[PDB]
Every structure is written in structure tokens, then in C-alpha cells.
């Protein structure tokens, strides 16, 4: 019997890019989930197949806390049955998803004067992402007859693009930190 280390997820100094979203597996802990829903730090707090207020009760074998950073416009794509750059090629939630989607503005944390280009996201992909799939390949696409062989060029694109996180951006283009809680049927409430 240990404590749920959710502090490592929400309070992390740096978040992962959405194409390489992080996943923290949790096992046999306990958490005061009544500390979570009433936190005014969260702007988006949507739970699917389960209610947030009644969360301090259920139990399961493993809860998964996935974290990444997308812009504010793309937060609606972190949801079941959604489409877009993020939902198709970065982070895809299943249709029968059972868990919560938490997100908050991190402009004060992830934006830099002149632009923060550390956060990236997959542009194109061979096929839409399966739910909970992580594609981290950076293979140049030989789009033309001439071979790139890692050499970017004419018909030789790089599959990833950087966000241009500047503080003066619009709220739809500001960075948001997302944490997706998913459950698997040890960890009970208190």
C-alpha cells in the first residue's frame, strides 16, 4: 500500500510533445481524488464512462496517466470519437473510453518570447492512429522518385512540425497541458 504519485504527472517541470506523449502506469496506490475536481487550476475536466465527483470510491488494477502539450484549439480533440491533426496522428482516445480528460492553460510555462519550438506534433501519417498508439518515428518521407536517404528536400518532408508558442498568441494558439486518466479492470479512493 503506497501513495498515488500523481504529483509527478501534473506538477512535472516539463511536459512531453504530443507525438511522444508520456504515459505513467500506476499500480497499487490510493489517492484523495476529492482534491482534484475542485481545483480551480483546471479549465477542462471532462470524465467519460465515470463521474468525477463519485471517483473517490472505485478500484482497479492500473490507472494510466497520459500527459502531453497541445494548443488550446486542439483540446476538443482529446475526446472519444474525434478527428483532427491530434486525434488522427498524435493522441487518439477510443470510442468506449472510460476515464477523465484534464487540461489547463500553460502559456505562463510553455511559451517563450520569440517562440518556444521544443513542443512538436506529427503532421502527416500513413494511417490514422489506433487508440492509445504512440508513433515516434521521424523517418523522412521519400515523396518523389529521387531518394532522400535522410536528406530533406524537394519531395522529402520531415513528418513533425514545431508549435510556435509565443506569449502574445491567441488563446486558441496558446499551449495547454493535458492529462488523460484511463482505468483498467489495488487503487481505491479515500
Amino acid at each position, epitope marked *: 500500500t503506497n501513495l498515488c504519485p*500523481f504529483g509527478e504527472v501534473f506538477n512535472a*517541470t516539463r511536459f512531453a510533445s504530443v507525438y511522444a506523449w508520456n504515459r505513467k502506469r500506476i499500480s497499487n496506490c490510493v489517492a484523495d481524488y476529492s*482534491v482534484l475536481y475542485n481545483s480551480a487550476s483546471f479549465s477542462t475536466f471532462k470524465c467519460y464512462g465515470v463521474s468525477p465527483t463519485k471517483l473517490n470510491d472505485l478500484c482497479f488494477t492500473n490507472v494510466y496517466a497520459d500527459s502531453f502539450v497541445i494548443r488550446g484549439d486542439e483540446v476538443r480533440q482529446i475526446a472519444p470519437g474525434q478527428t483532427g491533426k491530434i486525434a488522427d496522428y498524435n493522441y487518439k482516445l477510443p470510442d468506449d473510453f472510460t476515464g477523465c480528460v484534464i487540461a489547463w492553460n500553460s502559456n505562463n510555462l510553455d511559451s517563450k518570447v520569440g517562440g518556444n519550438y521544443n513542443y512538436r506534433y506529427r503532421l502527416f501519417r500513413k494511417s490514422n492512429l489506433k487508440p492509445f498508439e504512440r508513433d515516434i518515428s521521424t523517418e523522412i518521407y521519400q515523396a518523389g522518385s529521387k531518394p532522400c536517404n535522410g536528406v530533406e528536400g524537394f519531395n522529402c518532408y520531415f513528418p513533425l512540425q514545431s508549435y510556435g508558442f509565443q506569449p502574445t498568441n491567441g488563446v486558441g494558439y496558446q499551449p495547454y497541458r493535458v492529462v488523460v486518466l484511463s482505468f483498467e479492470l489495488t487503487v481505491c479512493g479515500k
Partner: antibody
Framework: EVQLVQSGAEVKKPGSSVKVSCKASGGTFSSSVISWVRQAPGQGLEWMGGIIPLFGSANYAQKFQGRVTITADESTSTAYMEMTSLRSEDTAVYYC???????????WGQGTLVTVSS | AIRMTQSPGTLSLSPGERATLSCRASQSVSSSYLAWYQQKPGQAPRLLIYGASSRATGIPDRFSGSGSGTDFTLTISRLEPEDFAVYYCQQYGTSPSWTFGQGTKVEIKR
């Protein structure tokens, strides 16, 4: 938000016992690791032990395993650190530190000065 | 138990120089559970870094934490004359089992 308040300074004679309190506010009490750190004058910070008020099982460092009892009270959100058979070497400033399971930051008390002398 | 050792025991630099404080762990420690404190004499310890790299409230951006595994670093880009103290590193976690370093003292050269 969160704040830790400790008891006042104590002047104990050798052989006596002292009990220092640590009132926590902010609602993160039960789901936290509340430790006790001792810093002798001129020396560094020394971790004595800690306890999770949700579990009650206190864990101590080897140096403090015999003379130190660390307890916590959820009904009043107060952690305690009792030490018996006080010696003049026990003269130090005792801080109570708190780590909530929902954060990586650490919350500290203002410190309690316990002077052991006749 | 885990043992935290800092290097150097004393760092002696002039104002404006760069201070590179080290903290070596006997085992691999999660980087999410390493803090750096600044203790001026007669004062309570002041938390500088938590989570190996997050600056506490009010800490200037000349302080930066870094490292992983067993080696961690507290870097002061340009020393101000106020940046003198005894700096400690701390391994903590979600279990009541923490250990501190022995401390590095930064004195001014003048």
C-alpha cells in the same frame, strides 16, 4: 493555500522529553508525506523520519529509530514529533516538511528551537 | 539507505562567475524527487529547485537545476553577492524516506 505551523521554542533539561506539533492547513493533510528534519547548530539538514497520515506507519532514519516517535492526527490535521531521553546533543532546530501526492513541491514549517541544557 | 554526496565541499568564486554545484546519489533516483535548498545563516532553508528543475516561487532565473540518474547539478549563471549560502540537495518521494546532502558552501572571492 497550504501552510505548516509549528509549536513554540522549548527549553528542556537532559533526560526529559519534548513533543513538537505541526498544524497543517490546505486539505492535503491526509494524502501527504509529512516528515521531520533536524538541523543541529553549525551542522546540516538531517532527515529524521516521516509518516503518511492515511497509513499511520511511521518510518524513521537509523540514527533516530530509538528516541523518536512521529505521529499524525487527521481529526485535527496536526503531526507530532516526540523525543525522549533528551541530551545536550539534541539541541537543534526541528522543521516539519510536507509533500503532497498531487505536487512535487515541498512545504515547510517555520521551525522549532529545542534547547537541551540545565 | 540512499546517500547524498555533494561536490565541492566549498565553492569559492568572484561575483559574476558561474557556480556548478553537484549532488551524487549512491543509487538511481527519480529526477521528479530532487530538491535544492539555499540556507543563509540564522535563517530557515529556502527551497530553490524541486523536481530537479522547477524553480520555486521568487527564485531568479539564474538558478537552474539539471541532472538524472545519479548525477545532478545546480547551476548559478552569474553569481550575485547575495547568492552566497550553504546549498543542500535532497532526495524525497511519495514514501517517508528522504536523505539530504552534506551541503556545499559558496563564498565570495574579493
Amino acid at each position: 493555500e497550504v501552510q505548516l505551523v509549528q509549536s513554540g521554542a522549548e527549553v528542556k533539561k537532559p533526560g526529559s522529553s519534548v513533543k513538537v506539533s505541526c498544524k497543517a492547513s490546505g486539505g492535503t493533510f491526509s494524502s501527504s508525506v509529512i516528515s521531520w528534519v533536524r538541523q543541529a547548530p553549525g551542522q546540516g539538514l538531517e532527515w529524521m523520519g516521516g509518516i503518511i497520515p492515511l497509513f499511520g506507519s511511521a518510518n524513521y532514519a537509523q540514527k533516530f529509530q530509538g528516541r523518536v516517535t512521529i505521529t499524525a492526527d487527521e481529526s485535527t490535521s496536526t503531526a507530532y514529533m516526540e523525543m525522549t531521553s533528551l541530551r545536550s546533543e539534541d539541541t537543534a532546530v526541528y522543521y516539519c516538511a510536507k509533500v503532497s501526492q498531487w505536487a512535487l513541491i515541498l512545504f515547510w514549517g517555520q521551525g522549532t528551537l529545542v534547547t537541551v541544557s540545565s | 539507505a540512499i546517500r547524498m554526496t555533494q561536490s565541492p565541499g566549498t565553492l569559492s568564486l568572484s561575483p559574476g562567475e558561474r557556480a556548478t554545484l553537484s549532488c551524487r546519489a549512491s543509487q538511481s533516483v527519480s529526477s521528479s524527487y530532487l530538491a535544492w535548498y539555499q540556507q543563509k545563516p540564522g535563517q530557515a532553508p529556502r527551497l530553490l529547485i524541486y523536481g530537479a528543475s522547477s524553480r520555486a516561487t521568487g527564485i531568479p532565473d539564474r538558478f537552474s537545476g539539471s541532472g538524472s540518474g545519479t548525477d545532478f547539478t545546480l547551476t548559478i549563471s552569474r553569481l550575485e553577492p547575495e547568492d552566497f549560502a550553504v546549498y543542500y540537495c535532497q532526495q524525497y518521494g511519495t514514501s517517508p524516506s528522504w536523505t539530504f546532502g552534506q551541503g556545499t558552501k559558496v563564498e565570495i572571492k574579493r
